[PDB]
Amino acid sequence: PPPLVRVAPSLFLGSARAAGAEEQLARAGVTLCVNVSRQQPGPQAPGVAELRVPVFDDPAEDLLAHLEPTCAAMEAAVRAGGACLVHSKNGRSRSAAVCTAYLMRHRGLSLAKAFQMVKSARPVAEPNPGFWSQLQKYEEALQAQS
Template identity: 50%
Template sequence: MLQLCKITDSLLISNSRSACDNGLLSGEGVTFCINVSKQQPFPGLRIGTLRVPVFDEPAENLYKYFDRCADAIQDVGTAGGRTLVYCKNGRSRSASICTAYLMKHRHLSLREAFEHVKSARPAVEPNEGFWDQLQRYEGELQSRQMEASPSTNG
């Protein structure tokens, strides 16, 4: 079944088959695609694209793309557009990117962000390596937040 699953008003997730259905993308108003794979195709529409060249392997470094992708999703949404994040099956890589976005820009914990993505697309299941990287990212975001907030002592 071809479908785009809505995570927020400006963020959708799917597998590559759905992502390459131009009618589906047009119907949902998708203006930007993040393709989290080395080999999956981009849709035929003339829209913004970003490739995150990783395989669905626990040893792959997806962490280094979290900030860039989260910021791109945020920027597209702020400009009134909609981002679709996809990988081959729409389960591990794309789910990890969407979870990272919710943690950074919606200030959700890893658990809350993941549950939100899973409620939109029940098939999601980041591999153990990506889950570890998301845990690391959560800690990184927390320490950034602490550095950014002014100290109240003294």
């Protein structure tokens, strides 16, 4: 199975099969799995919670809606001592989008710095152009609250 990639402390990214290995996630301390898909089956691991963000890897779909509620869940899981695994089918677009959204919202990065952080961990990271624009709107809105 492909490894999990540690994006940042208590933050992991993976492809779909990487979320199936119960032993990796236990090794990584993963307590919450964010499954950014509509069909991929998520963790079976005893005691690993799962949040499903149901989107196709598709510039039409509205991933912007789910960012703030998904990020709140993840930050809570980390502040309580756990860690998060964000996965999609390829570990390239949807999971990349949520990870950078998390880093902007809770680690106070700009979209550029945050995404450079995801890329360094995961070179193939590439949100489709629709998501990439939704993340700029997230940044816009974050700036205005901040």
